Paper text:
The DNA ligase Lig E is the most recently-delineated form of the diverse bacterial ATP-dependent DNA ligases (b-ADLs) which are found in the genomes of many bacterial species in addition to their replicative NAD-dependent DNA ligase. Lig E is distinguished by having a minimal structure lacking typical globular DNA binding domains or loop regions. Despite this, in vitro characterisation of recombinant Lig E enzymes from a range of bacteria have demonstrated that they are fully-functional ATP-dependent ligases with preferential activity on singly-nicked DNA and some, albeit weaker, activity on cohesive ends. The most intriguing structural aspect of Lig E however, is the N-terminal leader sequence which is predicted to direct its localisation to the periplasm.
To enable structural comparison with other Lig E proteins, Ngo-Lig E was crystalised in the presence of a 21 base-pair (bp) piece of DNA with a centrally placed phosphorylated nick. The resulting structure shows Ngo-Lig E in an open conformation bound to the DNA via interactions with its OB domain only. Covalent adenylation at Lys 22 is present in the NTase domain, indicating that we have captured a pre-step 2 state before complete encirclement of the DNA which would position the nick in the active site. Analysis of the Ngo-Lig E structure confirms the presence of the disulphide bond between Cys 176 and Cys 197 in the OB domain which was previously predicted by computational modelling. Examination of the linker region reveals a network of polar and electrostatic interactions that stabilise the open conformation of the domains including Lys 176 and Ser 170 from the linker with Glu 141 from the NTase domain; Tyr 172, Tyr 179 and His 201 from the OB domain with Lys 165, Glu 8 and Lys 10 of the NTase domain; Gln 171 of the linker with Arg 230 of the OB domain. Despite the use of a 21-mer DNA fragment in the crystallization condition, only 6 base-pairs were visible in the final structure. We suspect that, in the absence of the specific interactions imparted by nick-binding from the NTase domain, the Ngo-Lig E subunits have assembled non-specifically along the DNA filament; thus the 6 bp fragment in our structure represents a sample of the entire 21-mer piece. Key interactions with the DNA primarily involve basic residues from the OB domain and linker including Lys 239, Arg 205, Lys 185, Arg 215, Lys 211 and Arg 187. These residues contact the backbone phosphates of the ‘complement’ strand which is base-paired opposite the nicked strand in other ligase-DNA structures.
Author numbering: 1 to 247
The structure:
DNA sequence: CGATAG
DNA sequence: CTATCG
């Protein structure tokens, strides 16, 4: 119903937090009877897939292995497919009592007595400091992983955006709406130095990633563009914002 | 003054 | 080498 949503990591201290690998699957909320997607609609898996799920809710990601998102998404969006290989990788037991580790223990005992259920408890590792998190992320991207998830253990499960569940990657990518053009200095005078962009993060400039043709023929105001970035600024806006392509 | 993309 | 942002 009310799905706990993750923010992006900005620089908060995470000493004592619980980190895990960020899985590139499909979000699924188990309400004790149905698998509910982020859009609020129920999935339609084969009968017997959820037959050995617990009668209480579970929040997790429908996942199989690395680099398989397209295969997963295609499999779950159908009503004539095989879900073998797809499991619900659980990252919290929404309605249980205690800290994160005590809530997950509830689902762990269910797996003990239901070993053929297609469920997996996501390992949660204790975080020392920011350097440790970057280290864990560093080796995850090496194995082909996508990033790291950081969770405040003592926190509870709440719906909506939360500062206790943060995404951590080395290179993010998003989209924004071009709002304004800014003339460049020196050898970019009379043409584009940076564009103004707008999205859920507010307004900010993008000055890098532009060819010379892009600077002579910049993207129209109101156009949706894509851009990479790593980390955020003290103002709370994308850092190292690099233009990629249009649309 | 430093790091990045062109 | 030259520009953007950090
Ligand atoms: P990315 O921008 O793809 O967003 C990640 C979303 O997936 C959920 N998720 C995947 N894997 C995990 C783990 N291990 N822990 C917590 N959450 C996870 C996030 O909740 C985001 O919805």
């Amino acid at each position: 119903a009310d799905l706990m949503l993750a923010q992006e990591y900005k620089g908060q201290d995470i000493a004592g937090w619980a980190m895990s690998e960020k899985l590139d699957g499909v979000r699924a909320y188990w309400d004790g009877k149905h698998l509910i997607s982020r859009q609020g609609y129920a999935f339609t898996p084969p009968k017997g897939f959820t037959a050995q799920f617990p009668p209480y809710p579970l929040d997790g990601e429908l996942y199989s292995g690395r680099g398989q998102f397209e295969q997963i998404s295609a499999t779950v969006r159908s009503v004539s497919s095989d879900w073998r290989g797809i499991r619900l990788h659980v990252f919290d037991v929404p309605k249980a009592q205690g800290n994160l580790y005590q809530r997950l223990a509830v689902a762990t005992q269910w797996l003990k007595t239901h070993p053929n259920a297609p469920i997996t408890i996501i390992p949660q590792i204790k975080v020392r400091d920011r350097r440790h998190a970057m280290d864990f992320l560093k080796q995850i991207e090496a194995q082909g992983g996508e990033g790291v998830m950081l969770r405040q253990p003592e926190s509870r499960y709440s719906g909506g955006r939360s500062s206790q569940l943060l995404k951590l990657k080395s290179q993010y990518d998003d989209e924004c709406t071009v709002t304004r053009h800014y003339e460049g200095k020196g050898r970019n005078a009379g043409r584009l130095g940076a564009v103004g962009c707008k999205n859920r993060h507010g307004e900010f400039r993008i000055g890098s990633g532009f060819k010379d043709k892009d600077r002579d023929n910049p993207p129209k105001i109101g156009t949706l563009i894509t851009y990479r970035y790593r980390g955020f600024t003290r103002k709370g806006t994308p850092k190292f914002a690099t233009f990629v392509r249009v649309r």
